[PDB]
Design a protein around this ligand. Structure first.
Ligand SMILES: *[C@@H]1O[C@H](CO)[C@@H](O[C@@H]2O[C@H](CO)[C@@H](O[C@@H]3O[C@H](CO[C@H]4O[C@H](CO[C@H]5O[C@H](CO)[C@@H](O)[C@H](O)[C@@H]5O)[C@@H](O)[C@H](O[C@H]5O[C@H](CO)[C@@H](O)[C@H](O)[C@@H]5O)[C@@H]4O)[C@@H](O)[C@H](O[C@H]4O[C@H](CO)[C@@H](O)[C@H](O)[C@@H]4O)[C@@H]3O)[C@H](O)[C@H]2NC(C)=O)[C@H](O)[C@H]1NC(C)=O
Ligand SMILES: CCCCCCCC/C=C/CCCCCCCC(=O)O[C@H](COC(=O)CCCCCCCCCCCCCCC)COP(=O)(O)OC[C@@H](O)CO
Ligand SMILES: CC(C)CCC[C@@H](C)[C@H]1CC[C@H]2[C@@H]3CC=C4C[C@@H](O)CC[C@]4(C)[C@H]3CC[C@]12C
Lengths: 33, 122, 187, 9, 50
C-alpha cells in the first residue's frame, strides 16, 4: 500500500458530494417547488 | 411510567430501589478487577444505565411537583423561521404518556451504538 | 405526497448522517504520514498507532477516550468531547423520531432543527480545535518537528477529517431542511 | 398492567 | 555492639485518586442529590418522603 491515500480521499469526496447534492435537491424541491 | 400518578409511595419506591440496585451492581461488577484508576466498558455501561434510571426518577419527581404542588429573511418572520416560542403549562401532564417510548428507544439506540463500537472496532 | 415522503427521506438520511458521524468518531485514521515521514503510522482523535519500523513495521497502537491520560494533548480531549456532544445530540433526534406520534409535528421538527444546529456547532468547534493538538511530543516525534500548532508539517490529511468537514456541512443543510419543514408545513 | 388499565387510563 | 553501615533506598508513592472518585465520592454525592428530592415531593405524602 505504501503511503497512497489519494484514492480514499477521492472516493470519500465523491460520496460526500453526492449526498450533499441529494440534500440540496430535496431542499430546492421544498423551498420553491 | 405505567403506574398511576397518584401512587406516590409505589413509584418513589421503584425509583429509589432501582438506583440502589444500580449502585450494588456497579460495586459487584467492579470488584472483579484490580484497583485501576480508569474507566472500563462495564463501568461505562453501568454508568449509562444509572443515568437512565435516575432520569426516570427525576422525571416522576418533576411530574409530581408540577401536577400536585403547582397549577434579512426570505421567511416572512425572522423569529419563527430561525427560533421558536409559542408557550414553548401545555402538555406537562402528558409527560408519562410519551415518556413510555422515549426511554426504551433511547436505550435501544445506546445499546446499538455501544455494541457496534466495541464488538467490531475493538 | 410532499410531507409523507419528505419526512421519511429526511429521517432515513438523518440516520445515515448519525451513522457516518459515529463512524468518523471511532475511526483512528485521521492524520497519516506521507512518504516523507520520520516514522510510519497513522493518528486519530484518541488512538495513535506508531509504526516501530524494526523489521515488520509493527504498530504500537495505544490510546483510548476511556482514559484521558493516554490522550497526548488537551486539544484532542476537547475535540473528542465535542464530537461526543454532537453524536449525543443527533442520537437525541433519532430517539425523538418516536416522539412524533404523540406531540405536535411542527414543533418537534423545530426541536431537531435547533438541536441539529447545536450538534453542527459542537462538531464545528471540535473540528477547529483538532488542529490545535498537533504540538504534543508524540506528533512532533512521529510526524517530525515541522508539525506545530495549526501546522500540518509533514503530516497528511486522511479520509476522516474531510469526512467530518462534509459532516459539518451536511449537519448545517439538515438543520436548515428541518427548519423549513417545520415552518412551511404548518401553512 | 392491571393498575394501568383499571385504575389509570 | 558497635557502629554499623547502612544504605537506604526510599520511594515516595502518590495514590492515584481515580478509583475512589468512581466508587466512593460520586455515588455518595449522587445519593445526596437524590435524597434532596424529598423536599420537592408534596408534604402530605408521608410514606414516600419517609
Ligand atoms: C522518605 O523517608 C526517609 C526517612 O524519613 C527520608 O530519609 C531522609 O533523607 C535525608 C535526605 O533527604 C537524609 O539526610 C541526609 O543524610 C546524609 C547522611 O548524613 C549522615 O552521615 C554523614 C556522614 O557523611 C558521610 O555519609 C556517607 C557515609 O556514611 C557518605 O555519603 C559519605 O562518606 C559522607 O562523608 C554525617 O555527616 C551526617 O551528620 C549528621 O549529624 C551532624 C552532627 O553530628 C550534622 O552536622 C549533619 O548535618 C547531620 O545531621 C549524618 O549522620 C547527609 O549527607 C545529607 O545531608 C544533606 O544536607 C547537607 C547540608 O547540611 C547537604 O550538603 C547534603 O547534600 C544533603 O542535602 C542529609 O542530611 C536522612 O538521613 C534520611 N532519613 C533517615 C532516617 O536516614 C527520605 O528523604 C524520604 N523521602 C524520599 C522520597 O526518599
Ligand atoms: C447518554 C449519557 C452519556 C454519558 C457518558 C459519560 C462518559 C463517561 C466518561 C468520562 C471521561 C472518561 C475519561 C477521563 C476520566 C477517566 C480517566 C482517569 O484516569 O481519570 C482520573 C479521575 O477521573 C475519573 O476517574 C473519572 C472521571 C469521569 C467520571 C464520569 C462519570 C460518568 C457518569 C457516572 C454515573 C454515576 C453512577 C456511576 C457509579 C455507579 C484521573 O485521576 P488520576 O490522576 O488518579 O489518574 C492518573 C493515572 O496515572 C491513573 O489513572
Ligand atoms: C442514547 C444516547 C443518548 C447515548 C449517546 C452516548 C453514547 C453513544 C456514548 C457515550 C459514551 C461513549 C463511549 C465513550 C468512549 C469510548 C472509547 C473509544 O475508544 C471508542 C468509543 C467509545 C466506546 C464511546 C462510544 C459511544 C458512547 C457509549
Amino acid at each position: 500500500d505504501s503511503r497512497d491515500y489519494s484514492t480514499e480521499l477521492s472516493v470519500t469526496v465523491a460520496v460526500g458530494a453526492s449526498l450533499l447534492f441529494l440534500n440540496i435537491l430535496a431542499f430546492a424541491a421544498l423551498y420553491y417547488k | 411510567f405505567w403506574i398511576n400518578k397518584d401512587a406516590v409511595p409505589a413509584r418513589t419506591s421503584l425509583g429509589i430501589t432501582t438506583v440502589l440496585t444500580m449502585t450494588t451492581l456497579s460495586t459487584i461488577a467492579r470488584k472483579s478487577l484490580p484497583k485501576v484508576s480508569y474507566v472500563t466498558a462495564m463501568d461505562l455501561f453501568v454508568s449509562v444505565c444509572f443515568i437512565f434510571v435516575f432520569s426516570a426518577l427525576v422525571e416522576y419527581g418533576t411530574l409530581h411537583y408540577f401536577v400536585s404542588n403547582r397549577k434579512c429573511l426570505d421567511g416572512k418572520d425572522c423569529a419563527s423561521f430561525f427560533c421558536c416560542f409559542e408557550d414553548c403549562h401545555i402538555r406537562i401532564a402528558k409527560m408519562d404518556s410519551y415518556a413510555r417510548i422515549f426511554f426504551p428507544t433511547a436505550f435501544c439506540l445506546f445499546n446499538l451504538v455501544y455494541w457496534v463500537s466495541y464488538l467490531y472496532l475493538g | 405526497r410532499n410531507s409523507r415522503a419528505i419526512g421519511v427521506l429526511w429521517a432515513i438520511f438523518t440516520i445515515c448522517f448519525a451513522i457516518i458521524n459515529v463512524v468518523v468518531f471511532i475511526q483512528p485514521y485521521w492524520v497519516g504520514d506521507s512518504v516523507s515521514t520520520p516514522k510510519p503510522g497513522y493518528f486519530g482523535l484518541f488512538h495513535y498507532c506508531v509504526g516501530s519500523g524494526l523489521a515488520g513495521r509493527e504498530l504500537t497502537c495505544r490510546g483510548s477516550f476511556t482514559d484521558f491520560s493516554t490522550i497526548p494533548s488537551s486539544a484532542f480531549k476537547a475535540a473528542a468531547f465535542f464530537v461526543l456532544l454532537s453524536m449525543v445530540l443527533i442520537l437525541g433526534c433519532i430517539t425523538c423520531f418516536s416522539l412524533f406520534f404523540f406531540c405536535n409535528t411542527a414543533t418537534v421538527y423545530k426541536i431537531c432543527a435547533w438541536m441539529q444546529l447545536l450538534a453542527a456547532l459542537c462538531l464545528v468547534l471540535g473540528c477547529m480545535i483538532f488542529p490545535d493538538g498537533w504540538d504534543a511530543e508524540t506528533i512532533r516525534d512521529m510526524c517530525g518537528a515541522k508539525t506545530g500548532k495549526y501546522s500540518l508539517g509533514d503530516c497528511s490529511v486522511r479520509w476522516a477529517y474531510i469526512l467530518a468537514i462534509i459532516g459539518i456541512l451536511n449537519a448545517l443543510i439538515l438543520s436548515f431542511l428541518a427548519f423549513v419543514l417545520g415552518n412551511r408545513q404548518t401553512d | 398492567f392491571v393498575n394501568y388499565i383499571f385504575f389509570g387510563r | 555492639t558497635g557502629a554499623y553501615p547502612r544504605l537506604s533506598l526510599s520511594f515516595r508513592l502518590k495514590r492515584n485518586i481515580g478509583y475512589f472518585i468512581l466508587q466512593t465520592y460520586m455515588p455518595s454525592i449522587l445519593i445526596t442529590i437524590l435524597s434532596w428530592v424529598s423536599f420537592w415531593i408534596n408534604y402530605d405524602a408521608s410514606a414516600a418522603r419517609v
